[PDB]
Swiss-Prot record, chain A:
It is linked to Defects in Cdh23 are the cause of waltzer (v) phenotype. Waltzer mice are characterized by deafness and vestibular dysfunction due to degeneration of the neuroepithelium within the inner ear. Cadherins are calcium-dependent cell adhesion proteins. They preferentially interact with themselves in a homophilic manner in connecting cells. CDH23 is required for establishing and/or maintaining the proper organization of the stereocilia bundle of hair cells in the cochlea and the vestibule during late embryonic/early postnatal development. It is part of the functional network formed by USH1C, USH1G, CDH23 and MYO7A that mediates mechanotransduction in cochlear hair cells. Required for normal hearing. Residues 12-110, 111-206 form the Cadherin domain. It comes from the Eukaryota. It comes from Mus musculus (Mouse). Glycans are attached at residues 133, 184. Three calcium ions are usually bound at the interface of each cadherin domain and rigidify the connections, imparting a strong curvature to the full-length ectodomain. Cadherin repeats 1 and 2 mediate calcium-dependent heterophilic interaction with PCDH15. Interacts with USH1C and USH1G. antiparallel heterodimer with PCDH15. Isoform C1: Interacts with CAMSAP3; leading to inhibit CAMSAP3 ability to induce microtubule bundle formation. In adult animals relatively high levels of expression are found in testis, skeletal muscle, heart, eye and thymus, and lower expression in kidney, lung and brain. Found in the sensory hair cells of the inner ear. It is found in: Cell membrane. This is Cadherin-23.
Curated annotation (Swiss-Prot), chain B:
Antiparallel heterodimer with CDH23. Found in a complex with TMIE and LHFPL5. Interacts with LHFPL5/TMHS; this interaction is required for efficient localization to hair bundles. Interacts with MYO7A. Interacts with USH1G; this interaction may recruit USH1G to the plasma membrane. Interacts with TOMT. Isoforms CD1 and CD3 interact with TMC1 (via N-terminus) and TMC2 (via N-terminus). Interacts with PIEZO1. This is Protocadherin-15. Disulfide bonds join 12-100. The chain holds residues 27 to 259 of 1943 of the full protein. Calcium-dependent cell-adhesion protein. Required for inner ear neuroepithelial cell elaboration and cochlear function. Probably involved in the maintenance of normal retinal function. It comes from Mus musculus.
Length: 208, 238
């Protein structure tokens, strides 16, 4: 009489990790579980665990793993998932670390709005008058912000890296009493840069 | 033309396509100086007499990573210690940030690096006790389980992960007690529970020395580890 031999997974990803990009569409296959059984038993595959089960589904007869709901690296960047395989007499499980790959999917968000500053008409050329800041949660170039005025102003400049606004031309209250500038904060993603606008009000105060 | 100065912004961006994070795997307990990332592939020149970028490490928890900014290489710093994936250290991965500062425009880009630490079969099974014992009545029916002492980590355990840390138990022939492996069996190697295989006879033999070997389940048979214990089985009359 031969006692049952339980099945065993063969995927090499169990020895390292599995990488799934956060832009993977729901319903899409992400990998296929592979297993062997010394009795040549037909095997049934599944996923175990409350949270894992909400993100991943498994075709029972093939072991194909597919995405049950969208991933979001900015909400959860990795999962430890427990997969199962059964030969109808016993069930064995094994865990894999799943890393969620980043894509540029956030635009920058500005800090400390609203933006408004009052400056005297006699503010010298070169004077830093305001500092804008925005952040962006995506990785790498997708999270590195550049600032600009859209369009450029002949009276004010903004440092593209630091967000520091300076006067670049002598002001004249009787010509313009207030400026409404549009600040653009963009990430630097190569293929799909994302950006956000903020208003900066610059109020000129009279001397006479 | 607008954007004619965009060349100024290229330094610090990746000099490769693909996803933003750089992910690599290395074996636990790799020697000091092991290369983690051979080339970060960041645009620009760090170090030297006219650098265009500044490279440094951020969030380098416990200083496991060393950076050579000129080669853009990351290496393991493990002098005086070991990168141990098993308990009690439990280092499954190391995440650090390669901070790049563009000198011309002052922009900063962080390049995330994830180092996945692979388990090695560097631990053998260990038994909780130096030896094991069972008392069995002479009238015990053949097929009866007579020892379950390896249940709930009282037998052999192995601190490795996966199959490297799973145990199988088998009875070996004992040249000093030849009949012991014929009288007792472990039909289910995963539990190590011992079953009576032959009728006992107190008037003939009152003690058995059963040699039990625990092995782990490393993929490569020649990398498997084994440990042996003895189960002494004494018969009782009353
Ligand atoms: Ca089977
Ligand atoms: Ca996202
Ligand atoms: Ca993202
Ligand atoms: Ca972004
Ligand atoms: Ca170890
Ligand atoms: Ca082991
Ligand atoms: Ca290990
Ligand atoms: Cl300010
Ligand atoms: K273990």
């Amino acid at each position: 009489m031969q006692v049952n031999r339980l099945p065993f997974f063969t995927n090499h990803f169990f020895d390292t990790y599995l990488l799934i990009s956060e832009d993977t569409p729901v319903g899409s296959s992400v990998t296929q579980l592979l297993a062997r059984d010394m009795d040549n038993d037909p095997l049934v595959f599944g996923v175990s665990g409350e949270e894992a089960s909400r993100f991943f589904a498994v075709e029972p007869d093939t072991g194909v793993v597919w995405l049950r709901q969208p991933l979001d690296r900015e909400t959860k960047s990795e999962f430890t998932v427990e997969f199962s395989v059964s030969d109808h007499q016993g069930v064995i499980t094994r865990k894999v670390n799943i890393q969620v790959g980043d894509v540029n999917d956030n635009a920058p968000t500005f800090h400390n709005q609203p933006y408004s500053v009052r400056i005297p008409e006699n503010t010298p050329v070169g004077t830093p008058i305001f500092i804008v800041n925005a952040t962006d949660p995506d990785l790498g170039a997708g999270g590195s912000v550049l600032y600009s005025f859209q369009p450029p102003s002949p009276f004010f400049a903004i440092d593209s890296a630091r967000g520091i606004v300076t006067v670049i031309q002598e002001l004249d209250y009787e010509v313009t009493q207030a400026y409404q500038l549009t600040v653009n904060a963009t990430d630097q993603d190569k293929t799909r840069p994302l950006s956000t606008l903020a208003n900066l009000a610059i109020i000129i105060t009279d001397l006479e | 033309m607008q954007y004619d100065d965009d060349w100024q912004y290229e330094d610090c961006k990746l000099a490769r396509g693909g996803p933003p994070a750089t992910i690599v795997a290395i074996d636990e307990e790799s020697r000091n100086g092991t290369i983690l990332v051979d080339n970060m592939l960041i645009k620009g020149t760090a170090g030297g007499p006219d650098p265009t970028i500044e490279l440094s490490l951020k969030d380098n928890v416990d200083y496991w990573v060393l950076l050579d900014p000129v080669k853009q290489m990351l290496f393991l710093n493990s002098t005086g210690r070991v990168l141990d994936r098993d308990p009690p250290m439990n280092i499954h991965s190391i995440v650090v940030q390669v901070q790049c500062v563009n000198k011309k425009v002052g922009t900063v880009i962080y390049h995330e690096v994830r180092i996945v630490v692979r388990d090695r079969n560097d631990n053998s099974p260990t038994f909780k006790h130096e030896s094991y014992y069972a008392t069995v009545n002479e009238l015990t029916p053949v097929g009866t389980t007579i020892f379950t002492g390896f249940s709930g980590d009282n037998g052999a355990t192995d601190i490795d992960d996966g199959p490297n840390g799973q145990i199988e138990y088998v009875i070996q022939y004992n040249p000093e007690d030849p009949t012991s492996n014929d009288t007792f069996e472990i039909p289910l190697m995963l539990t190590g529970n011992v079953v009576l295989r032959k009728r006992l006879n107190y008037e003939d033999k009152t003690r058995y020395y059963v040699i039990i070997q625990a092995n782990d389940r490393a993929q490569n048979l020649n990398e498997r580890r084994t440990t042996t214990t003895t189960l002494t089985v004494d018969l009782e009359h009353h």
